[PDB]
Amino acid sequence: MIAGSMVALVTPFDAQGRLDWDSLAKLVDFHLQDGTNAIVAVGTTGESATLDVEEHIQVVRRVVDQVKGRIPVIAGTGANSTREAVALTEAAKSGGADACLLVTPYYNKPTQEGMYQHFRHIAEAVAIPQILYNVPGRTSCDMLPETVERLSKVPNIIGIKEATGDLQRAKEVIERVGKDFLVYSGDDATAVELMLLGGKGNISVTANVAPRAMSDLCAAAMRGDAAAARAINDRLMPLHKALFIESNPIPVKWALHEMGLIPEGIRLPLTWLSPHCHDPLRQAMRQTGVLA
Amino acid sequence: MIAGSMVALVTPFDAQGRLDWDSLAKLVDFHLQDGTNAIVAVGTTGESATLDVEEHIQVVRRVVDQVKGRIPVIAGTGANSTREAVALTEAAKSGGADACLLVTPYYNKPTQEGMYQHFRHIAEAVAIPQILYNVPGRTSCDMLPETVERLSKVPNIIGIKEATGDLQRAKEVIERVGKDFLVYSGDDATAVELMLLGGKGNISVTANVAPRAMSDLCAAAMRGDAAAARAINDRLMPLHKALFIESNPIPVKWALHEMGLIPEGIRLPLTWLSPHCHDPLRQAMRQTGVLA
């Protein structure tokens, strides 16, 4: 029920660092108008690591407030402390969010078993749908398909955001879980193929700068237009690459500022897109029709 | 001064989840007696991830207090946010810490330029020696040697904890940094050689169960008495591997509980040592003379 083009929404800051309510509103109208199937506020792209417990609910509120029930609002709520996690989920719930995206405990290095008991605890604790998040390249830990399987049998856990970008890991998670457990792509470049395999959506980053095209990609890939889907993806590959030319979301913000959607403001330890990367990404945005 | 065998202290929890101040006192006493040179309170081994902010200071203070200043107290205060990094550090400085160990930002994966800006700021906001801690095995982020040279030259940044376990790196670093900057070991397996190369200490995990042997080992090494340094390191090798038979600090906690020093107690997501790994570890503590 939550599927398709989903935006891992960035979170606007002004040159000084403060949040820009003016810009969030626009981003939301942009994706609203352009047809994104769901918004994911306060995720990795939303710079979830550098927001106040207070800044994180405020953000969810004013997004939920504006969507106004039209499409699903998903809140990033994962901590690597289980208690810090229930805290954030509780907050996102009491924010009006519709579901939560929870990333596996980072830095921490949990065992598969610890990962399991971590997630059930949270699913038990906060009555709100929850979507797992596997992304080893950032976590340094990894939720084996064997564990996702166990998890899928828990009440309010209804999906996973699989971000290895490994298409066999997908061909496996999908094969292990029921059809009512949804597997999402967390890697834009290969999100088209994962959907062709039985995937139901792409929590995307590209979608920040080209939301319409991403709906088109997701729709065709979900019907079965394998030739149509890959043709769209092929058309967007230069962009998927460019959006990750330096750690995310550094690239996608540069993009959005260039489209005049967000100010030039990104919190440390993240920096603004270094000068080298500007013309390879400005050209991509052009080569792919989001910039003139 | 800060050098030699430094224990990365575990922070004990009773069966229900609370902090056992008795046991923390016992551990301190234990290291204080068997020859430890310093204490890294509330670090990765200290299970910082799952600690409260209040719980954080409540210990660094308690240990300092109990140390009577006989030995330096290094507090972990690294966060993946520049802001709480500065906050946590302001705390350790108030609690009475003598210097801080800060991990390179985990999960958000900075730019090298970002790391530099990260640490530099923190160094100008809190007057207190700082020790850089590098560990891509956990942070999905590697602070190159260029970035290290660059930071070594910042006023109250006095060293680095190097975990890569790659000796060639901690040979390029010693080369690049001054005579006054201090390189410490992160990897317990390779610490000895890092010191033979010009290292100044080992921020040890094994030292938890075997502080006295580690003191010795560091002495031999920093004297250039490789002959002896290695003799000890071999009789500890069984230990060095066993204590990571499962993510730190899950194993070392268990061993500590086995010696009668700390209660069974570890916070979620971390779990208790899987039965699986009980014979393997227990045997090592025997091979090693910490248990008969």
UniProtKB/Swiss-Prot annotation, chains A, B:
EC number(s) given by UniProt: 4.3.3.7
Activity-pH dependence: Optimum pH is 8.0. At pH 9.0 or above, only 30% activity is observed.
Active site: residue positions: 133, 161
Comment on activity versus temperature: Optimum temperature is 37 degrees Celsius. The activity decreases slowly when temperatures are reduced from 37 degrees Celsius while the drop in activity is relatively more rapid when temperatures are raised above 37 degrees Celsius. In this case, the activity reduces to almost 30% at 52 degrees Celsius.
InterPro entries: Aldolase_TIM, DapA, DapA-like, Schiff_base-form_aldolases_AS, Schiff_base-form_aldolases_CS
Molecular function as annotated in GO: 4-hydroxy-tetrahydrodipicolinate synthase activity
PROSITE patterns for the chain: DHDPS_1 (PS00665), DHDPS_2 (PS00666)
Keywords: Amino-acid biosynthesis, Cytoplasm, Diaminopimelate biosynthesis, Lyase, Lysine biosynthesis, Schiff base
Subunit comment: Homodimer.
Protein name per Swiss-Prot or TrEMBL: 4-hydroxy-tetrahydrodipicolinate synthase
Species, as recorded: Pseudomonas aeruginosa (strain ATCC 15692 / DSM 22644 / CIP 104116 / JCM 14847 / LMG 12228 / 1C / PRS 101 / PAO1)
Gene field: dapA
